[PDB]
């Protein structure tokens, strides 16, 4: 089968932080991955370390 990718546009908007002395987010927080970001494999080539946990089921 042959299928083409879909549009990268999605609902919502970009993260925005409220102004003033009261620091608070408006739509999204810091942990937001844009639709045009690269693959996770290339961003973290090192991967889990030897002393890392092999079960993140906290």
């Amino acid at each position: 089968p042959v299928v083409f990718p879909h549009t990268r546009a999605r609902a919502g908007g970009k993260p925005i932080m409220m102004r003033g002395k009261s620091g608070k987010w408006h739509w999204l927080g810091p942990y937001w991955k844009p639709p045009w970001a690269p693959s996770n494999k290339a961003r973290w080539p090192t991967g889990p370390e030897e002393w890392a946990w092999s079960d993140p089921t906290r």
Binding site: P1, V2, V3, F4
Partner: protein, 59 residues
């Protein structure tokens, strides 16, 4: 659209492999031969072996 018949790369690769009864992809490395330059470099030396055109440089 998923049922469309378009000639892709993997589609043709599988067709050739199916013909071989239970003949796979193979690659070839560059051919490095020492006689290509070993037996030819000496000829070029004759064009400059004269003492009046070699000693001045490598003196």
């Amino acid at each position: 659209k998923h049922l469309d018949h378009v000639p892709t790369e993997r589609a043709r690769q599988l067709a050739e492999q199916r013909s071989a009864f239970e003949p796979h992809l193979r690659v070839k490395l560059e051919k490095e031969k020492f006689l290509r330059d070993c037996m030819r470099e000496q000829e070029n030396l004759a064009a400059l072996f004269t003492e009046t055109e070699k000693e001045t440089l490598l003196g």
